[PDB]
Amino acid sequence: SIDSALNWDGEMTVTRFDKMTGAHFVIRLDSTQLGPAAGGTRAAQYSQLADALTDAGKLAGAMTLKMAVSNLPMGGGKSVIALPAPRHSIDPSTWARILRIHAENIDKLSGNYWTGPDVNTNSADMDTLNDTTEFVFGRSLERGGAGSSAFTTAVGVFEAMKATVAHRGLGSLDGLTVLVQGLGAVGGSLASLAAEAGAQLLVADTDTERVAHAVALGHTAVALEDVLSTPCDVFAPCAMGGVITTEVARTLDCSVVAGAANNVIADEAASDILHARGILYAPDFVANAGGAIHLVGREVLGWSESVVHERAVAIGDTLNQVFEISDNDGVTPDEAARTLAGRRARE
Amino acid sequence: SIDSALNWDGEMTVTRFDSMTGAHFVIRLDSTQLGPAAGGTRAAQYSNLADALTDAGKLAGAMTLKMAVSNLPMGGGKSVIALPAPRHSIDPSTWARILRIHAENIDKLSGNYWTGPDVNTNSADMDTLNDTTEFVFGRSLERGGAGSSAFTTAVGVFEAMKATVAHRGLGSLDGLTVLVQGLGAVGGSLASLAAEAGAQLLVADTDTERVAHAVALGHTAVALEDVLSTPCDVFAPCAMGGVITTEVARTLDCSVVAGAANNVIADEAASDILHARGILYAPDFVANAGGAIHLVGREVLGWSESVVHERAVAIGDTLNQVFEISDNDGVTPDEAARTLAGRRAREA
Numbered sequence: 001s002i003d004s005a006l007n008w009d010g011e012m013t014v015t016r017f018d019k020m021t022g023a024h025f026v027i028r029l030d031s032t033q034l035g036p037a038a039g040g041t042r043a044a045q046y047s048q049l050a051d052a053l054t055d056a057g058k059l060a061g062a063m064t065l066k067m068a069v070s071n072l073p074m075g076g077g078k079s080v081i082a083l084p085a086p087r088h089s090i091d092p093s094t095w096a097r098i099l100r101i102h103a104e105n106i107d108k109l110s111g112n113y114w115t116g117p118d119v120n121t122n123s124a125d126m127d128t129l130n131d132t133t134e135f136v137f138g139r140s141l142e143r144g145g146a147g148s149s150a151f152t153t154a155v156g157v158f159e160a161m162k163a164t165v166a167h168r169g170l171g172s173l174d175g176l177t178v179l180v181q182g183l184g185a186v187g188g189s190l191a192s193l194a195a196e197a198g199a200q201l202l203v204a205d206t207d208t209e210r211v212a213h214a215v216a217l218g219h220t221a222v223a224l225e226d227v228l229s230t231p232c233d234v235f236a237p238c239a240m241g242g243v244i245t246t247e248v249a250r251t252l253d254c255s256v257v258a259g260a261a262n263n264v265i266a267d268e269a270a271s272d273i274l275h276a277r278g279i280l281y282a283p284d285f286v287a288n289a290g291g292a293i294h295l296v297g298r299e300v301l302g303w304s305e306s307v308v309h310e311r312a313v314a315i316g317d318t319l320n321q322v323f324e325i326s327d328n329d330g331v332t333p334d335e336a337a338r339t340l341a342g343r344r345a346r347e
Numbered sequence: 348s349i350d351s352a353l354n355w356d357g358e359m360t361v362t363r364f365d366s367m368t369g370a371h372f373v374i375r376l377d378s379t380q381l382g383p384a385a386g387g388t389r390a391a392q393y394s395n396l397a398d399a400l401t402d403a404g405k406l407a408g409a410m411t412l413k414m415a416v417s418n419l420p421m422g423g424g425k426s427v428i429a430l431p432a433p434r435h436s437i438d439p440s441t442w443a444r445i446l447r448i449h450a451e452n453i454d455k456l457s458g459n460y461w462t463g464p465d466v467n468t469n470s471a472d473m474d475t476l477n478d479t480t481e482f483v484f485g486r487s488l489e490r491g492g493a494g495s496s497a498f499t500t501a502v503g504v505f506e507a508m509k510a511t512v513a514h515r516g517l518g519s520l521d522g523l524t525v526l527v528q529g530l531g532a533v534g535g536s537l538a539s540l541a542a543e544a545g546a547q548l549l550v551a552d553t554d555t556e557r558v559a560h561a562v563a564l565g566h567t568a569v570a571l572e573d574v575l576s577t578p579c580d581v582f583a584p585c586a587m588g589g590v591i592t593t594e595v596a597r598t599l600d601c602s603v604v605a606g607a608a609n610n611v612i613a614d615e616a617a618s619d620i621l622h623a624r625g626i627l628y629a630p631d632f633v634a635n636a637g638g639a640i641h642l643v644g645r646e647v648l649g650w651s652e653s654v655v656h657e658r659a660v661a662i663g664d665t666l667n668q669v670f671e672i673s674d675n676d677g678v679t680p681d682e683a684a685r686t687l688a689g690r691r692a693r694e695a
C-alpha cells in the first residue's frame with residue numbers, strides 16, 4: 001500500500017534502479033536498536049515497486065521482532081530485489097550483475113546491515129555477494145559461513161507446532177492431520193519430522209514433482225485450489241506470506257496454524273478472527289526463528305550445530321510463554337509475542 | 348510518480364519517514380567514483396515525495412559534475428528534507444529532531460556521504476548534525492568547520508559572470524545592467540561585487556526588507572512578476588533553481604546568464620534554446636562551485652583561505668575552457684562543461 005511503501009516508520013530505506021538489468025533493489029532497516037539490522041535477501045517479481053517496498057518493510061519489521069523474541073543480539077532488516085523477470089528466467093550474467101549491485105548497496109551500509117539467504121537466494125548467492133561485501137551470513141561452509149539453515153528452521157517450526165498442538169489441548173502430533181503448504185527445503189523436512197511424530201500429512205506444492213515425491217513417500221497431495229478449504233488439525237504454511245487474509249481466517253478448517261512462512265497474517269483483523277474461532281496461531285516471527293538462530297548463533301555467537309539445534313528446540317518454550325501472556329492478558333498470540341519480544345528486549 | 352522518480356540511475360537512494368514530525372528524508376548519492384559523495388542538505392516543502400526525490404537526484408548529479416569539473420576528489424550527493432510545513436513555522440524542538448534523524452541517516456552511510464549547508468540549513472544546523480555524526484562540512488568555526496561558504500560562492504559567480512560577459516563580447520561589467528534575482532547570502536554579496544565593478548543593478552527578492560536595503564544602496568527594484576521579462580545584459584539567478592524553463596528561455600531578454608542557483612535550467616530544451624538564441628549561459632555546476640571549493644578545500648584538502656579564494660577565481664578560467672569546447676565542437680555550454688568534467692575526472 002502507499003502507506004506501507006511511503007510512510008513506513010522504519011529506520012532506513014535504501015533503493016536503487018539498474019537500467020541494464022532492469023532490476024530494482026530495496027533494503028529496509030527496520031531497527032538497529034539491538035545491533036546491526038539483519039535479514040535475508042528475497043528475489044522475486046513484483047507488479048509494482050510499491051509492493052516491493054511494502055514487503056521489504058513488513059519483512060524487516062518481522063526480523064526486528066524475531067531477533068528480539070529470540071534473544072539474538074541483532075536488529076531487523078530485509079532486502080528485496082524486484083526482478084525484471086522470473087528468477088528462473090534470468091540469465092546467469094544478469095543474475096551475477098544483480099548480485100554485484102546488491103552487494104555494493106549493502107557495502108555502503110558498512111555493517112549496519114547483514115544479509116542472508118531468502119526466497120530465491122542461496123548460499124552460492126551469498127558467496128557471490130561475499131566476493132564484494134563482508135556483511136553476509138549464510139555463505140557456504142566452504143566459504144566460511146554456516147551454510148544452510150533450512151533444517152534448523154524446520155526443527156524450530158516442528159517444536160513450535162508441538163508446543164502449539166499441546167497448548168491447544170490436542171496432545172501430541174500422533175494421530176493428527178497436518179497440511180504442509182510448500183515442500184521446499186523447510187516444508188519437506190517439517191513434513192518428515194511431523195510424519196515421524198505420527199502425523200498424517202497432506203501436502204501441496206506448485207511443483208508437480210515435489211508433490212509426486214511426497215506422495216511416493218506415503219503422503220497425500222492437496223490441489224492448490226483446495227489448500228485453504230481442506231480440513232486438517234494443523235495448517236502449516238511453508239510457502240508464501242500473506243496467506244491468511246480476513247477471508248481465509250474466517251474459513252480455514254483447522255485448530256492450529258504453525259508454519260515456516262514469513263508474514264503469514266495479512267491483516268490484524270485476520271489474527272483476531274483466528275483467535276476468536278479457536279484456531280491457535282504460533283506467531284511466524286517466533287516459530288520460524290530457527291533460521292536466524294542458526295545464522296546469528298553460529299556466525300555471530302560461535303555456537304555449534306548442536307547448540308543451535310537446542311536453541312531452535314527452545315522455540316517451543318518461547319511459544320509456551322507467548323501463549324501464557326495471551327491467555328492471561330486476553331490478547332492474540334501475535335500481540336502477546338510482540339509483548340514478549342519487548343520484554344526480552346528490555347524495552 | 349514515486350515510480351518514475353525511482354527510475355534514477357544514481358548509485359543509491361536513502362529515504363526515511365518520521366511520523367512524529369511528519370518529515371520525509373532523502374539522501375541521493377549520484378556517484379562515489381571520485382570519492383565519497385558530498386552535497387548540501389536542502390530543507391523545503393514539496394507537493395509530493397516524488398518531487399523531493401527528483402530534486403535530490405538532479406542536485407546530486409550536478410554535485411558529481413561540480414566536484415569533477417572543479418577538481419575536488421569527491422563524488423556527488425545531495426539531501427533533501429521534505430518539510431511538513433514551512434521552515435519558519437517549524438518549532439525548534441521539531442527542527443532539532445528532524446536534524447537528529449537526518450544525522451542518524453547520514454551516519455549509517457558511514458563516510459560514503461558527507462553533507463553541508465544548503466537551502467534552509469546553516470552552520471548551526473551543521474553543528475547540531477555533528478552532535479550525532481561525523482560526516483558534516485560547514486560546521487561553525489568554533490566546532491571545527493569552515494563556516495559559511497556564501498561569500499566564496501559569490502566570488503566564484505562574480506568571476507564566472509566576468510568571464511562570461513567577456514566571452515560574449517560585452518566587455519567588462521562596467522556599465523552593464525545585471526539583474527540579480529535573490530538577495531540572500533550569496534546574491535547580496537554578488538550584487539555588491541558587481542556594483543563595485545561598475546554594473547547597474549536591478550534586484551528582486553520576496554523579502555521586501557532586502558530589496559529596501561538594496562534600493563538604499565542605489566540599486567533598482569524589479570517586481571517579482573517582472574523578473575523574467577526585464578531586459579538586462581546579465582541575468583543572475585541566485586534564488587531558486589528551475590527558473591529557466593523552455594518557455595522562459597525563448598523570451599529571456601539578456602545576453603548572459605550567470606548566477607548562483609543550483610539547477611538553473613529546468614529542461615534540456617531550455618539549454619538548447621539559450622544557446623541557439625545567442626544567450627551565453629555559464630553552467631550552474633561550474634559557476635557556483637565556490638561553495639564546494641570552500642568546504643572541500645578547507646575541510647578536506649587542507650587549503651588556505653587564500654588558495655580557496657584563488658580556486659574560486661579560477662572558475663572564470665574553467666568557464667573559458669567550457670566556452671572553448673562549446674565553440675569548437677558546436678555544443679551547448681552545459682554539454683561542454685560535462686565534457687570538461689569528464690576530462691578532468693580522468694586526468695585526475
Ligand SMILES: NC(=O)c1ccc[n+]([C@@H]2O[C@H](COP(=O)([O-])OP(=O)(O)OC[C@H]3O[C@@H](n4cnc5c(N)ncnc54)[C@H](O)[C@@H]3O)[C@@H](O)[C@H]2O)c1
Nearest residue numbers: 149153182183184185186204205206238239260261262291
Ligand atoms: N529457509 C529458512 O531458513 C527459512 C527461515 C525462515 C523463514 N522461512 C520462510 O519459509 C518459507 C519457505 O522457505 P523455504 O526455504 O523452504 O523455500 P523454498 O523455495 O525452498 O520452497 C518453497 C516451496 O513452496 C512451493 N510453493 C510456492 N508457492 C506455493 C503455493 N502457493 N502453494 C504451494 N506451494 C507453493 C515452492 O514450489 C517450493 O517447493 C518462506 O516464506 C520463507 O520466507 C524460511
Ligand SMILES: NC(=O)c1ccc[n+]([C@@H]2O[C@H](COP(=O)([O-])OP(=O)(O)OC[C@H]3O[C@@H](n4cnc5c(N)ncnc54)[C@H](O)[C@@H]3O)[C@@H](O)[C@H]2O)c1
Nearest residue numbers: 496497500529530531532533552553585586607608609638
Ligand atoms: N550559499 C552557497 O554557498 C551556495 C553554493 C552553491 C549554490 N548555491 C545556491 O545559490 C542560491 C542562493 O543561495 P543563498 O545561500 O544565498 O540562499 P539564501 O537563502 O541565503 O538566499 C536566497 C534569497 O532569495 C530570496 N528569494 C527566495 N525566493 C525568491 C524568489 N522567488 N524571487 C526572489 N527572491 C527570492 C530569499 O528571500 C533570499 O534572500 C540557492 O539556489 C543555493 O542552492 C548556494
Ligand SMILES: O=C(O)[C@@H](O)Cc1ccccc1
Nearest residue numbers: 038039040115116291292295
Ligand atoms: O529470518 C531468516 O531466517 C532470513 O531473513 C535469513 C536471515 C536470518 C538472520 C540473519 C540474516 C538472514
Ligand SMILES: O=C(O)[C@@H](O)Cc1ccccc1
Nearest residue numbers: 385386387462463638639642
Ligand atoms: O554545492 C554546494 O555548495 C552545497 O551542496 C554544499 C556542499 C558542497 C560540498 C560538500 C558538501 C556540501
Ligand SMILES: [K+]
Nearest residue numbers: 016017355357
Ligand atoms: K538508482
Ligand SMILES: [K+]
Nearest residue numbers: 117118121122
Ligand atoms: K533460499
Ligand SMILES: [K+]
Nearest residue numbers: 171172174175
Ligand atoms: K494427537
Ligand SMILES: [K+]
Nearest residue numbers: 464465468469
Ligand atoms: K544555507
Ligand code: NA
Nearest residue numbers: 467468469472
Ligand atoms: Na535552518
